[PDB]
Design a protein around this ligand. Sequence first.
Ligand code: ZN
Lengths: 158, 137, 108, 84, 73, 143, 103
Amino acid sequence: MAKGNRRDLLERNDIEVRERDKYTVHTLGKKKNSVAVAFVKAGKGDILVNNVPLALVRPEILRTKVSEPIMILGESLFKGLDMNIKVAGGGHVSQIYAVRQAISRGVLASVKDEAARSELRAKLVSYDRQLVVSDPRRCEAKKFGGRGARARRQKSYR
Amino acid sequence: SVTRVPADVFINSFAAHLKNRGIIKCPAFTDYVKTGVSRQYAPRDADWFYIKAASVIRHFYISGSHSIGVAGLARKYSSLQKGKTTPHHTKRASCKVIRSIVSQFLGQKLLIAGERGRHISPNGRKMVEDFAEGLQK
Amino acid sequence: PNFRGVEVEKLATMKITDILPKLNARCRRRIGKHGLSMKHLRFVNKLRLRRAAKIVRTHLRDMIIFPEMIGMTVSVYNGRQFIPVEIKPPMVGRALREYSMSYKIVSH
Amino acid sequence: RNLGSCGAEDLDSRVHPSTIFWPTEADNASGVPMRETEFCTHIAHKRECRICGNYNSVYRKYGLFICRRCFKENAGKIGFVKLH
Amino acid sequence: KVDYPTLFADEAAMNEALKFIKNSKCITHTQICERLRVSVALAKRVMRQLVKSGDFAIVSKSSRMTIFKNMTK
Amino acid sequence: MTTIVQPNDYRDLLRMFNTNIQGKVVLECALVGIKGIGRRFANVALKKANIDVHKRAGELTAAEEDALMKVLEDPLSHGIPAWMLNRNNDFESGKDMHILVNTIASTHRADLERLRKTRCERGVRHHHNLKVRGQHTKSTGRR
Amino acid sequence: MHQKYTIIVVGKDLKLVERYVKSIVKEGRAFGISGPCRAPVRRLTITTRKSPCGEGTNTWHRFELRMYKRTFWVTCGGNDISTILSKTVVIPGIQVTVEVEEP
RNA sequence: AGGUCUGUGAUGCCCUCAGACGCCCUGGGCCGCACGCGCGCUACACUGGCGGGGCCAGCCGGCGCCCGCGAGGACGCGCGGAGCCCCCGCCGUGGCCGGGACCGCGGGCUGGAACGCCCCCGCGCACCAGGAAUGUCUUGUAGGCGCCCGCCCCCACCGCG
Ligand SMILES: [Zn+2]
């Protein structure tokens, strides 16, 4: 239902103010019509999605996909960070991929050191480059000649 | 709370408890109903009413101070009408059962009346969270 | 026979309102809620006058039958000429469209 | 015929005086009540292009009421522009 | 063309149906259906009884398919 | 259900209303073979009759069988809604009943006879073999 | 005095509708007039066959007319009806750039 | 000499002009069916059908209470989004719980007026992957899945998106 670019979602005004400030880092990730917003604060370590524990997100079979940014690296740094992700857009899979992208970008920023940041960048991008850089391709239009983007209505030459 | 436990276990356990405690009591017209024009046949299980009620109460708890109309819940139980040699079209569920369920809940003060519709009363939130922690272990 | 269990000999002079709750949706709607219209009432009054005292030709093709019209002789239009029709008890509660053919059957 | 009528028992069947629901479209003719008895007693909407008196293929969207064919000629002035 | 009983009349339900598998390690409702020459639901129910007995265990349960193993061998 | 070995009373081939039901299919759907009896009117009928609807047809017993017979001839006297009967109303009785295989032939037949004598439009299209409802026949269903 | 007045600008052309606001904000330099909310564009759409007789390959015109609009409800009662007229005069005269003031 | 004088206060020349081809009113017809084919829609099933549950879109978008199985109906106010899919069970290769054409009672809506459209019970046609022939397509593409607008008193298997 949510567009993804609403001012409310982008600024995460849903959270109460006194807890809004404690989140410092801001991150973003998207795939196709899906926008995921992540706020980070250092802590004992934990993740959330749309007010849900990270484990119990229901593509089920894609749990490893939502958690790849973690098991790729060590849990050492993920231990000291806590996230409150909020996602909205089109399709379960798109939301999944956007979420993992946001996780990667957010963890990358919080390192606070540029050299180790570059080292993590090299490690992560070696694996699936589309964990940091976004995916560009997007749905295209349809022309009146046919009933699809490229397909045309069947023609009878006789 | 509830949000850290999947809906599959929570719904069934709360349904069993809701039947044992005698909160909701299935009326007579639960014998011969199809639950929505979209469907074709009748429910196979013998206690669909209580599952439906538990899903509804969870829906109300998740919505917080927002208010949900009887029809608003009926669009979340919509299905697809088939068997008509024409493209399938979506349709809404039945509202009478939902209405009876909310009446039964409200008669127990678990569901406060708002400006439009209703929302979860504080004691209802208490009960939902209590069962959630009780079954979390 | 009968009519929804109602008698026939008494069906004469038997109030249309009483039978109305014994018919289908269309009659209980038009006759009750939406009501009737002037020309049809004039038609019925004319038929009453004749029965009290030649076939009544008419263009009316949606004039739901009454019960007292059993045994009457009325002609009807089919877009070209005038057809005769006689009303029978089981035919009560219906229109005059079904009893006047506008086309003709097909043959080879 | 002003001094005549039907039976009272039949009068109960008179159509509800509740005004008819089949009006006539007026883009902007004062609503006021021999051949006058039935010159145009039949009542029906007559929506038509406000340019050409043609009742066929008229857009009612946004309250235009313009024939599709006569739309192209004046679209340039009306503001509609052909891009994309 | 092929007709399968939906329930064993008698004996069949222990002399063999509960024994043919015993001389097997892996199985599935369809494997036995084609093997034992009977319907599917019978295999479902019988496998329920067997797992309750404890001899036969599960490896990958799902709504569509549930492979079993002969733990007691 | 919860049955592996057959009942000692297992009736392998049931019979009712001049129709025979094989005793190896689930109960609710096997009964559908009766003309005039579908699913909806099945699961409702049994339940009022205190019968399990997921047990094989071969397992029922006389007492259950006859009990079902009774509700199946005088159903309105058992709570079933009046809007559920196949014949929601009758022309001569004026009441609401449910008719079955033995007397379902004389329900479209005698109906037709009524159409003929009245010289209705609907009857004529039934005699020359034409569509009854508003249906295009220029190119539809060519024989 | 104070009226909680509103300013609304409606038009089709992006050029003038964007230049006119700049002059307005100039005029409200000292009366506190501030940023305008820019509503989503109301892209009206119409399609039509290009052939009056419907011959040949079926083709379609696609005309659309956008309706940009901006709102300067900032003034509210911050200004008096005395200079609300002054607000409406020092502004430039654009031929078509409809506007309306409500409280 | 492709189509359009039947889009127009765009028009030459012909035909009609007081028993009218003018304008208007009541009816009927444009849908009528032994048959030939053109664009489409639904299927012939286990990579599936039914029931319960969880859940996310965009062109954009209106809701509460109460009766009614449902379609719908009486009130009162400004408030708000889905199919595929995933999970648990039943069915078990049988033209069967695949398929929903056709037909019989009935309950409602629009309209002055149902021949129009919806919902319920019942009956349950062909169809076992389709010959000669032939059409379209290279990334968010084909294919599958659904959702809004157009003409519209009611109705979308159509068209634009
Ligand atoms: Zn025009």
